[PDB]
Amino acid sequence: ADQLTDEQIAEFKEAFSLFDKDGDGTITTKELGTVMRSLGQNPTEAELQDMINEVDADGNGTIDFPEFLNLMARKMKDTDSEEELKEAFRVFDKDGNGFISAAELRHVMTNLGEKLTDEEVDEMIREADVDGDGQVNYEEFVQVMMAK
Amino acid sequence: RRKWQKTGHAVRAIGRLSSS
Ligand SMILES: [Ca+2]
Ligand SMILES: [Ca+2]
Ligand SMILES: [Ca+2]
Ligand SMILES: [Ca+2]
């Protein structure tokens, strides 16, 4: 199995809210589809139903927070455990040059529905940018993604 | 870090729910 810290759980609660935009406590196929399409993906209704099905333990058709936590607590089955984090980084690093620019970060924040002013987005870059080049490389991304 | 974790984990959640 696995065990999550209270901090990790709180972080996942915030992530959950980006899917559950109406705040009703559940993620519907429509809500999951909306986020994925905003990020450039194109899941079919059948695929969305399958994704929901995987974690929909009670089978009520939607994903609630407890089920979301299980998703985030499942251990990786892919031999190389870091690909998931590298793939996430590539979503932010739009032009794939290895560094997330403020422009690229603003775009992903907007796509995810994370409403932030340009100034707030610069504060994110500043927190992650340890070497001071004004952008965020993979290593810096890893560090700000760490729960502790 | 919450802004990075909130968004980064949302991206990761999608990755786990879907195949690559
Ligand atoms: Ca909802
Ligand atoms: Ca359910
Ligand atoms: Ca880039
Ligand atoms: Ca940097």
mmCIF file with all atom_site columns, C-alpha atoms and ligand atoms in Angstrom:
data_model
loop_
_atom_site.group_PDB
_atom_site.id
_atom_site.type_symbol
_atom_site.label_atom_id
_atom_site.label_alt_id
_atom_site.label_comp_id
_atom_site.label_asym_id
_atom_site.label_entity_id
_atom_site.label_seq_id
_atom_site.pdbx_PDB_ins_code
_atom_site.Cartn_x
_atom_site.Cartn_y
_atom_site.Cartn_z
_atom_site.occupancy
_atom_site.B_iso_or_equiv
_atom_site.pdbx_formal_charge
_atom_site.auth_seq_id
_atom_site.auth_comp_id
_atom_site.auth_asym_id
_atom_site.auth_atom_id
_atom_site.pdbx_PDB_model_num
ATOM   1   C  CA . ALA A 1 1   ? 0.000   0.000  0.000   1.00 0.00 ? 1   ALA A CA 1
ATOM   2   C  CA . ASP A 1 2   ? 1.266   3.473  0.947   1.00 0.00 ? 2   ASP A CA 1
ATOM   3   C  CA . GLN A 1 3   ? 0.788   6.221  3.570   1.00 0.00 ? 3   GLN A CA 1
ATOM   4   C  CA . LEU A 1 4   ? 0.241   9.939  2.925   1.00 0.00 ? 4   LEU A CA 1
ATOM   5   C  CA . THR A 1 5   ? 1.212   12.781 5.268   1.00 0.00 ? 5   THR A CA 1
ATOM   6   C  CA . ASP A 1 6   ? -1.377  15.394 6.239   1.00 0.00 ? 6   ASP A CA 1
ATOM   7   C  CA . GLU A 1 7   ? 0.590   17.884 4.154   1.00 0.00 ? 7   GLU A CA 1
ATOM   8   C  CA . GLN A 1 8   ? 0.414   15.707 1.050   1.00 0.00 ? 8   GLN A CA 1
ATOM   9   C  CA . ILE A 1 9   ? -3.306  15.239 1.577   1.00 0.00 ? 9   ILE A CA 1
ATOM   10  C  CA . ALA A 1 10  ? -3.877  18.996 1.849   1.00 0.00 ? 10  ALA A CA 1
ATOM   11  C  CA . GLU A 1 11  ? -1.882  19.516 -1.325  1.00 0.00 ? 11  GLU A CA 1
ATOM   12  C  CA . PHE A 1 12  ? -3.973  16.958 -3.155  1.00 0.00 ? 12  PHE A CA 1
ATOM   13  C  CA . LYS A 1 13  ? -7.146  18.645 -1.838  1.00 0.00 ? 13  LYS A CA 1
ATOM   14  C  CA . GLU A 1 14  ? -6.044  21.824 -3.587  1.00 0.00 ? 14  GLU A CA 1
ATOM   15  C  CA . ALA A 1 15  ? -5.283  19.905 -6.798  1.00 0.00 ? 15  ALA A CA 1
ATOM   16  C  CA . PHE A 1 16  ? -8.725  18.288 -6.584  1.00 0.00 ? 16  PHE A CA 1
ATOM   17  C  CA . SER A 1 17  ? -10.368 21.746 -6.654  1.00 0.00 ? 17  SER A CA 1
ATOM   18  C  CA . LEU A 1 18  ? -8.912  22.436 -10.107 1.00 0.00 ? 18  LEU A CA 1
ATOM   19  C  CA . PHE A 1 19  ? -10.998 19.533 -11.422 1.00 0.00 ? 19  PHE A CA 1
ATOM   20  C  CA . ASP A 1 20  ? -14.013 20.136 -9.189  1.00 0.00 ? 20  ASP A CA 1
ATOM   21  C  CA . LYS A 1 21  ? -14.583 23.668 -10.454 1.00 0.00 ? 21  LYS A CA 1
ATOM   22  C  CA . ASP A 1 22  ? -18.178 23.866 -9.224  1.00 0.00 ? 22  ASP A CA 1
ATOM   23  C  CA . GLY A 1 23  ? -17.041 22.725 -5.780  1.00 0.00 ? 23  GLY A CA 1
ATOM   24  C  CA . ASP A 1 24  ? -19.720 20.072 -5.332  1.00 0.00 ? 24  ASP A CA 1
ATOM   25  C  CA . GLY A 1 25  ? -17.205 17.571 -3.970  1.00 0.00 ? 25  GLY A CA 1
ATOM   26  C  CA . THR A 1 26  ? -16.989 15.348 -7.041  1.00 0.00 ? 26  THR A CA 1
ATOM   27  C  CA . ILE A 1 27  ? -15.236 15.216 -10.399 1.00 0.00 ? 27  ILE A CA 1
ATOM   28  C  CA . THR A 1 28  ? -17.546 14.362 -13.309 1.00 0.00 ? 28  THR A CA 1
ATOM   29  C  CA . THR A 1 29  ? -16.487 13.184 -16.772 1.00 0.00 ? 29  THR A CA 1
ATOM   30  C  CA . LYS A 1 30  ? -17.361 16.674 -18.007 1.00 0.00 ? 30  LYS A CA 1
ATOM   31  C  CA . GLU A 1 31  ? -15.038 18.309 -15.490 1.00 0.00 ? 31  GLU A CA 1
ATOM   32  C  CA . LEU A 1 32  ? -12.164 15.926 -16.198 1.00 0.00 ? 32  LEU A CA 1
ATOM   33  C  CA . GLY A 1 33  ? -12.697 16.400 -19.919 1.00 0.00 ? 33  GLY A CA 1
ATOM   34  C  CA . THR A 1 34  ? -12.707 20.177 -19.557 1.00 0.00 ? 34  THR A CA 1
ATOM   35  C  CA . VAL A 1 35  ? -9.359  20.283 -17.790 1.00 0.00 ? 35  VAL A CA 1
ATOM   36  C  CA . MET A 1 36  ? -7.687  17.839 -20.184 1.00 0.00 ? 36  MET A CA 1
ATOM   37  C  CA . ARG A 1 37  ? -8.927  19.715 -23.235 1.00 0.00 ? 37  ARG A CA 1
ATOM   38  C  CA . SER A 1 38  ? -7.723  23.021 -21.766 1.00 0.00 ? 38  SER A CA 1
ATOM   39  C  CA . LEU A 1 39  ? -4.290  21.390 -21.489 1.00 0.00 ? 39  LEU A CA 1
ATOM   40  C  CA . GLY A 1 40  ? -4.372  20.379 -25.144 1.00 0.00 ? 40  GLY A CA 1
ATOM   41  C  CA . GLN A 1 41  ? -5.595  16.784 -24.840 1.00 0.00 ? 41  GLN A CA 1
ATOM   42  C  CA . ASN A 1 42  ? -8.656  15.258 -26.537 1.00 0.00 ? 42  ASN A CA 1
ATOM   43  C  CA . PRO A 1 43  ? -10.090 12.341 -24.505 1.00 0.00 ? 43  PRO A CA 1
ATOM   44  C  CA . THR A 1 44  ? -13.215 10.641 -25.840 1.00 0.00 ? 44  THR A CA 1
ATOM   45  C  CA . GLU A 1 45  ? -16.290 10.107 -23.702 1.00 0.00 ? 45  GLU A CA 1
ATOM   46  C  CA . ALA A 1 46  ? -15.440 6.417  -23.540 1.00 0.00 ? 46  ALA A CA 1
ATOM   47  C  CA . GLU A 1 47  ? -11.916 7.190  -22.332 1.00 0.00 ? 47  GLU A CA 1
ATOM   48  C  CA . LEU A 1 48  ? -13.217 9.624  -19.707 1.00 0.00 ? 48  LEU A CA 1
ATOM   49  C  CA . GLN A 1 49  ? -15.636 6.973  -18.434 1.00 0.00 ? 49  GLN A CA 1
ATOM   50  C  CA . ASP A 1 50  ? -12.786 4.475  -18.236 1.00 0.00 ? 50  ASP A CA 1
ATOM   51  C  CA . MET A 1 51  ? -10.569 6.916  -16.340 1.00 0.00 ? 51  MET A CA 1
ATOM   52  C  CA . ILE A 1 52  ? -13.376 7.569  -13.845 1.00 0.00 ? 52  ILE A CA 1
ATOM   53  C  CA . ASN A 1 53  ? -14.090 3.839  -13.572 1.00 0.00 ? 53  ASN A CA 1
ATOM   54  C  CA . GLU A 1 54  ? -10.511 3.076  -12.499 1.00 0.00 ? 54  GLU A CA 1
ATOM   55  C  CA . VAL A 1 55  ? -10.762 5.038  -9.244  1.00 0.00 ? 55  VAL A CA 1
ATOM   56  C  CA . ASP A 1 56  ? -14.552 5.094  -8.844  1.00 0.00 ? 56  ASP A CA 1
ATOM   57  C  CA . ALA A 1 57  ? -14.580 2.573  -6.004  1.00 0.00 ? 57  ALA A CA 1
ATOM   58  C  CA . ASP A 1 58  ? -18.257 3.012  -5.107  1.00 0.00 ? 58  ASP A CA 1
ATOM   59  C  CA . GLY A 1 59  ? -19.238 3.139  -8.768  1.00 0.00 ? 59  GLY A CA 1
ATOM   60  C  CA . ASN A 1 60  ? -21.454 6.204  -8.442  1.00 0.00 ? 60  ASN A CA 1
ATOM   61  C  CA . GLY A 1 61  ? -20.107 7.634  -11.691 1.00 0.00 ? 61  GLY A CA 1
ATOM   62  C  CA . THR A 1 62  ? -17.916 10.396 -10.235 1.00 0.00 ? 62  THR A CA 1
ATOM   63  C  CA . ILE A 1 63  ? -14.633 10.774 -8.369  1.00 0.00 ? 63  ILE A CA 1
ATOM   64  C  CA . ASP A 1 64  ? -14.857 12.201 -4.839  1.00 0.00 ? 64  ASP A CA 1
ATOM   65  C  CA . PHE A 1 65  ? -11.898 13.343 -2.771  1.00 0.00 ? 65  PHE A CA 1
ATOM   66  C  CA . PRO A 1 66  ? -11.321 10.075 -0.928  1.00 0.00 ? 66  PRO A CA 1
ATOM   67  C  CA . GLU A 1 67  ? -11.129 8.297  -4.292  1.00 0.00 ? 67  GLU A CA 1
ATOM   68  C  CA . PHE A 1 68  ? -8.798  11.021 -5.621  1.00 0.00 ? 68  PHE A CA 1
ATOM   69  C  CA . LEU A 1 69  ? -6.459  10.430 -2.679  1.00 0.00 ? 69  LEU A CA 1
ATOM   70  C  CA . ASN A 1 70  ? -6.299  6.731  -3.533  1.00 0.00 ? 70  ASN A CA 1
ATOM   71  C  CA . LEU A 1 71  ? -5.273  7.677  -7.064  1.00 0.00 ? 71  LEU A CA 1
ATOM   72  C  CA . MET A 1 72  ? -2.487  9.877  -5.751  1.00 0.00 ? 72  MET A CA 1
ATOM   73  C  CA . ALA A 1 73  ? -1.377  7.246  -3.231  1.00 0.00 ? 73  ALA A CA 1
ATOM   74  C  CA . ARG A 1 74  ? -1.020  4.340  -5.655  1.00 0.00 ? 74  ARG A CA 1
ATOM   75  C  CA . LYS A 1 75  ? 2.608   3.366  -6.271  1.00 0.00 ? 75  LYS A CA 1
ATOM   76  C  CA . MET A 1 76  ? 4.039   3.565  -9.793  1.00 0.00 ? 76  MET A CA 1
ATOM   77  C  CA . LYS A 1 77  ? 4.050   0.423  -11.948 1.00 0.00 ? 77  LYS A CA 1
ATOM   78  C  CA . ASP A 1 78  ? 6.447   1.909  -14.502 1.00 0.00 ? 78  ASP A CA 1
ATOM   79  C  CA . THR A 1 79  ? 9.974   0.622  -13.863 1.00 0.00 ? 79  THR A CA 1
ATOM   80  C  CA . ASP A 1 80  ? 11.366  4.163  -14.036 1.00 0.00 ? 80  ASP A CA 1
ATOM   81  C  CA . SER A 1 81  ? 9.557   6.029  -11.276 1.00 0.00 ? 81  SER A CA 1
ATOM   82  C  CA . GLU A 1 82  ? 10.659  9.517  -12.329 1.00 0.00 ? 82  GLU A CA 1
ATOM   83  C  CA . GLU A 1 83  ? 9.050   9.641  -15.782 1.00 0.00 ? 83  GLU A CA 1
ATOM   84  C  CA . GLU A 1 84  ? 5.772   10.840 -14.281 1.00 0.00 ? 84  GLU A CA 1
ATOM   85  C  CA . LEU A 1 85  ? 7.436   13.904 -12.782 1.00 0.00 ? 85  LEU A CA 1
ATOM   86  C  CA . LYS A 1 86  ? 9.419   14.524 -15.991 1.00 0.00 ? 86  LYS A CA 1
ATOM   87  C  CA . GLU A 1 87  ? 6.200   14.282 -17.994 1.00 0.00 ? 87  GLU A CA 1
ATOM   88  C  CA . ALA A 1 88  ? 4.541   16.802 -15.674 1.00 0.00 ? 88  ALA A CA 1
ATOM   89  C  CA . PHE A 1 89  ? 7.502   19.155 -16.131 1.00 0.00 ? 89  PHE A CA 1
ATOM   90  C  CA . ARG A 1 90  ? 7.177   18.901 -19.906 1.00 0.00 ? 90  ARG A CA 1
ATOM   91  C  CA . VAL A 1 91  ? 3.566   20.043 -19.667 1.00 0.00 ? 91  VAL A CA 1
ATOM   92  C  CA . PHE A 1 92  ? 4.831   23.279 -18.080 1.00 0.00 ? 92  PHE A CA 1
ATOM   93  C  CA . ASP A 1 93  ? 7.891   23.615 -20.302 1.00 0.00 ? 93  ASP A CA 1
ATOM   94  C  CA . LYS A 1 94  ? 5.916   24.318 -23.481 1.00 0.00 ? 94  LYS A CA 1
ATOM   95  C  CA . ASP A 1 95  ? 8.800   24.654 -25.935 1.00 0.00 ? 95  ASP A CA 1
ATOM   96  C  CA . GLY A 1 96  ? 10.605  21.745 -24.290 1.00 0.00 ? 96  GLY A CA 1
ATOM   97  C  CA . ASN A 1 97  ? 13.947  23.521 -23.986 1.00 0.00 ? 97  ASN A CA 1
ATOM   98  C  CA . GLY A 1 98  ? 14.385  22.448 -20.370 1.00 0.00 ? 98  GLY A CA 1
ATOM   99  C  CA . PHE A 1 99  ? 13.311  25.649 -18.647 1.00 0.00 ? 99  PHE A CA 1
ATOM   100 C  CA . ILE A 1 100 ? 9.893   26.945 -17.622 1.00 0.00 ? 100 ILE A CA 1
ATOM   101 C  CA . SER A 1 101 ? 9.643   30.639 -18.501 1.00 0.00 ? 101 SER A CA 1
ATOM   102 C  CA . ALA A 1 102 ? 7.255   33.062 -16.837 1.00 0.00 ? 102 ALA A CA 1
ATOM   103 C  CA . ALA A 1 103 ? 5.289   33.167 -20.113 1.00 0.00 ? 103 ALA A CA 1
ATOM   104 C  CA . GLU A 1 104 ? 4.958   29.380 -20.188 1.00 0.00 ? 104 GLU A CA 1
ATOM   105 C  CA . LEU A 1 105 ? 3.935   29.273 -16.524 1.00 0.00 ? 105 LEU A CA 1
ATOM   106 C  CA . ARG A 1 106 ? 1.262   31.934 -17.032 1.00 0.00 ? 106 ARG A CA 1
ATOM   107 C  CA . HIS A 1 107 ? -0.188  29.872 -19.870 1.00 0.00 ? 107 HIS A CA 1
ATOM   108 C  CA . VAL A 1 108 ? -0.404  26.628 -17.886 1.00 0.00 ? 108 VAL A CA 1
ATOM   109 C  CA . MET A 1 109 ? -1.899  28.448 -14.891 1.00 0.00 ? 109 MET A CA 1
ATOM   110 C  CA . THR A 1 110 ? -4.591  29.887 -17.163 1.00 0.00 ? 110 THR A CA 1
ATOM   111 C  CA . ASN A 1 111 ? -5.249  26.508 -18.783 1.00 0.00 ? 111 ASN A CA 1
ATOM   112 C  CA . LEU A 1 112 ? -5.666  24.784 -15.409 1.00 0.00 ? 112 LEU A CA 1
ATOM   113 C  CA . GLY A 1 113 ? -7.992  27.490 -14.176 1.00 0.00 ? 113 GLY A CA 1
ATOM   114 C  CA . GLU A 1 114 ? -5.513  28.613 -11.509 1.00 0.00 ? 114 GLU A CA 1
ATOM   115 C  CA . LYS A 1 115 ? -6.370  32.340 -11.507 1.00 0.00 ? 115 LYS A CA 1
ATOM   116 C  CA . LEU A 1 116 ? -3.249  34.365 -10.754 1.00 0.00 ? 116 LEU A CA 1
ATOM   117 C  CA . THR A 1 117 ? -2.029  37.848 -11.633 1.00 0.00 ? 117 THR A CA 1
ATOM   118 C  CA . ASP A 1 118 ? 1.209   38.115 -13.603 1.00 0.00 ? 118 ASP A CA 1
ATOM   119 C  CA . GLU A 1 119 ? 2.847   39.304 -10.362 1.00 0.00 ? 119 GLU A CA 1
ATOM   120 C  CA . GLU A 1 120 ? 1.709   36.181 -8.536  1.00 0.00 ? 120 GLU A CA 1
ATOM   121 C  CA . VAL A 1 121 ? 3.068   34.046 -11.330 1.00 0.00 ? 121 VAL A CA 1
ATOM   122 C  CA . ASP A 1 122 ? 6.425   35.808 -11.039 1.00 0.00 ? 122 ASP A CA 1
ATOM   123 C  CA . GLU A 1 123 ? 6.376   35.004 -7.330  1.00 0.00 ? 123 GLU A CA 1
ATOM   124 C  CA . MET A 1 124 ? 6.085   31.311 -8.278  1.00 0.00 ? 124 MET A CA 1
ATOM   125 C  CA . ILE A 1 125 ? 9.096   31.583 -10.595 1.00 0.00 ? 125 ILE A CA 1
ATOM   126 C  CA . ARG A 1 126 ? 11.016  33.390 -7.854  1.00 0.00 ? 126 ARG A CA 1
ATOM   127 C  CA . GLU A 1 127 ? 10.276  30.679 -5.289  1.00 0.00 ? 127 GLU A CA 1
ATOM   128 C  CA . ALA A 1 128 ? 11.457  27.907 -7.593  1.00 0.00 ? 128 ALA A CA 1
ATOM   129 C  CA . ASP A 1 129 ? 14.321  29.723 -9.262  1.00 0.00 ? 129 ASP A CA 1
ATOM   130 C  CA . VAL A 1 130 ? 17.320  28.877 -7.123  1.00 0.00 ? 130 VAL A CA 1
ATOM   131 C  CA . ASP A 1 131 ? 20.131  29.517 -9.622  1.00 0.00 ? 131 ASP A CA 1
ATOM   132 C  CA . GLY A 1 132 ? 18.794  32.957 -10.518 1.00 0.00 ? 132 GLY A CA 1
ATOM   133 C  CA . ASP A 1 133 ? 18.480  32.726 -14.309 1.00 0.00 ? 133 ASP A CA 1
ATOM   134 C  CA . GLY A 1 134 ? 14.855  33.823 -14.037 1.00 0.00 ? 134 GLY A CA 1
ATOM   135 C  CA . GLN A 1 135 ? 13.382  30.558 -15.228 1.00 0.00 ? 135 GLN A CA 1
ATOM   136 C  CA . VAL A 1 136 ? 12.707  27.152 -13.714 1.00 0.00 ? 136 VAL A CA 1
ATOM   137 C  CA . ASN A 1 137 ? 14.696  24.054 -14.708 1.00 0.00 ? 137 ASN A CA 1
ATOM   138 C  CA . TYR A 1 138 ? 13.704  20.474 -13.958 1.00 0.00 ? 138 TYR A CA 1
ATOM   139 C  CA . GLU A 1 139 ? 15.688  20.266 -10.722 1.00 0.00 ? 139 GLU A CA 1
ATOM   140 C  CA . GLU A 1 140 ? 14.072  23.436 -9.393  1.00 0.00 ? 140 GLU A CA 1
ATOM   141 C  CA . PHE A 1 141 ? 10.632  22.072 -10.371 1.00 0.00 ? 141 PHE A CA 1
ATOM   142 C  CA . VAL A 1 142 ? 11.360  18.881 -8.419  1.00 0.00 ? 142 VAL A CA 1
ATOM   143 C  CA . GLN A 1 143 ? 12.222  20.888 -5.324  1.00 0.00 ? 143 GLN A CA 1
ATOM   144 C  CA . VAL A 1 144 ? 9.059   23.000 -5.278  1.00 0.00 ? 144 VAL A CA 1
ATOM   145 C  CA . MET A 1 145 ? 6.976   19.879 -5.947  1.00 0.00 ? 145 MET A CA 1
ATOM   146 C  CA . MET A 1 146 ? 8.378   18.195 -2.807  1.00 0.00 ? 146 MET A CA 1
ATOM   147 C  CA . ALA A 1 147 ? 5.852   18.087 0.042   1.00 0.00 ? 147 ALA A CA 1
ATOM   148 C  CA . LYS A 1 148 ? 8.734   18.671 2.451   1.00 0.00 ? 148 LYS A CA 1
ATOM   149 C  CA . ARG B 2 1   ? 5.005   25.812 -2.833  1.00 0.00 ? 1   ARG B CA 1
ATOM   150 C  CA . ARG B 2 2   ? 1.243   25.202 -2.674  1.00 0.00 ? 2   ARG B CA 1
ATOM   151 C  CA . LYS B 2 3   ? 0.660   26.925 -6.010  1.00 0.00 ? 3   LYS B CA 1
ATOM   152 C  CA . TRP B 2 4   ? 3.216   24.639 -7.675  1.00 0.00 ? 4   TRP B CA 1
ATOM   153 C  CA . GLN B 2 5   ? 1.940   21.521 -5.902  1.00 0.00 ? 5   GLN B CA 1
ATOM   154 C  CA . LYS B 2 6   ? -1.719  22.319 -6.573  1.00 0.00 ? 6   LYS B CA 1
ATOM   155 C  CA . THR B 2 7   ? -1.122  22.682 -10.298 1.00 0.00 ? 7   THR B CA 1
ATOM   156 C  CA . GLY B 2 8   ? 1.696   20.170 -10.659 1.00 0.00 ? 8   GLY B CA 1
ATOM   157 C  CA . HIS B 2 9   ? -0.307  17.470 -8.926  1.00 0.00 ? 9   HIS B CA 1
ATOM   158 C  CA . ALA B 2 10  ? -3.375  18.236 -11.034 1.00 0.00 ? 10  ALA B CA 1
ATOM   159 C  CA . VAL B 2 11  ? -1.162  17.584 -14.051 1.00 0.00 ? 11  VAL B CA 1
ATOM   160 C  CA . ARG B 2 12  ? 0.168   14.408 -12.452 1.00 0.00 ? 12  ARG B CA 1
ATOM   161 C  CA . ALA B 2 13  ? -3.346  13.226 -11.602 1.00 0.00 ? 13  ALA B CA 1
ATOM   162 C  CA . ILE B 2 14  ? -4.270  13.413 -15.285 1.00 0.00 ? 14  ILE B CA 1
ATOM   163 C  CA . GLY B 2 15  ? -1.130  11.521 -16.195 1.00 0.00 ? 15  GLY B CA 1
ATOM   164 C  CA . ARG B 2 16  ? -2.091  8.711  -13.815 1.00 0.00 ? 16  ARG B CA 1
ATOM   165 C  CA . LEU B 2 17  ? -5.695  8.589  -15.008 1.00 0.00 ? 17  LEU B CA 1
ATOM   166 C  CA . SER B 2 18  ? -4.513  8.344  -18.615 1.00 0.00 ? 18  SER B CA 1
ATOM   167 C  CA . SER B 2 19  ? -1.989  6.253  -20.529 1.00 0.00 ? 19  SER B CA 1
ATOM   168 C  CA . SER B 2 20  ? 1.131   7.645  -22.218 1.00 0.00 ? 20  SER B CA 1
HETATM 169 CA CA . CA  C 3 .   ? -17.806 18.930 -9.449  1.00 0.00 ? 1   CA  C CA 1
HETATM 170 CA CA . CA  C 3 .   ? -17.230 7.595  -6.768  1.00 0.00 ? 2   CA  C CA 1
HETATM 171 CA CA . CA  C 3 .   ? 10.691  26.460 -22.011 1.00 0.00 ? 3   CA  C CA 1
HETATM 172 CA CA . CA  C 3 .   ? 16.534  28.712 -12.582 1.00 0.00 ? 4   CA  C CA 1
#
